[PDB]
Amino acid sequence: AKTSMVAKQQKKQKYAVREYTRCERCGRPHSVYRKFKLCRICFRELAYKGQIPGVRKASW
Template structure:
């Protein structure tokens, strides 16, 4: 089980990302289409004024059940430990735990 503070921090980051997503896209497109270097610098300064946690790269995938960030499977939205337990109990349809 992950620390509650880490999970809450990621929830806060997700909310900030959603709030500033459109602004970031507009500013980034201005940076790419800027005709002069000064326009580009001005747009980059505006981008830096946005909160850091609103950036896409700061979002971490976490298991929705335990909050674990490592060993995350996107297909299920779960960590490897949780998938293993659920596969043993037959809770994930079509998934068997292999053994040899």
């Protein structure tokens, strides 16, 4: 993401509804999970590295 856009997301918004979530690792605005503050791509990469406690590939 753009550095200015990340900074603007981090800064306080005059509105309150004007708040949106960004992935805190790369800055992608879309598809960010609340529990991890990560987008799907970073989530996959870190789960592969095993650095997200208790998260593993699922099957059933």
